[PDB]
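Why this split exists: single-chain examples teach little about how molecules sit against one another. For that reason, every record in the complexes split bundles all components of an assembly together and asks for one structure covering all of them. Below is a record exactly as it appears in the raw files.
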Amino acid sequence: TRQKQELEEELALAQAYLEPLERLAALAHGLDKSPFLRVIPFLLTEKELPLVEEALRKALEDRYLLAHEAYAGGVPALVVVHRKEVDQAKAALSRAGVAE
Amino acid sequence: GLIKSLAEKEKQLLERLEAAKKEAEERVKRAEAEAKALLEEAEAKAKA
């Protein structure tokens, strides 16, 4: 029964979150294990996408990279920012109400 | 904006660091060797 519970919880999460993580991984392929670049994953709905972009753009100038790729419904979005620009990047998501 | 910009720029940032560390060690290396050979000339000369 213990195996069975672990097997069932794993399925339940994996069934939910495989498609976003696939999308997100793909967007910054081979750049998630680099120290030079920082990646932050987050989910946005069609509604939220414009607000988030504005907020990041003012906060982070034009030296930030906002990319998104669909999955059937909203977009999992990835913002890629320089290392040591992490706090600022985060602060920008937090003001819109979007989190990591 | 393509991911290719930062991707293929990162893999150059790593080469620039590597040459830095190389020619740091390959310089000090020379000096340590040159310090030995100098003090051998100072023994060779001094006893003769």
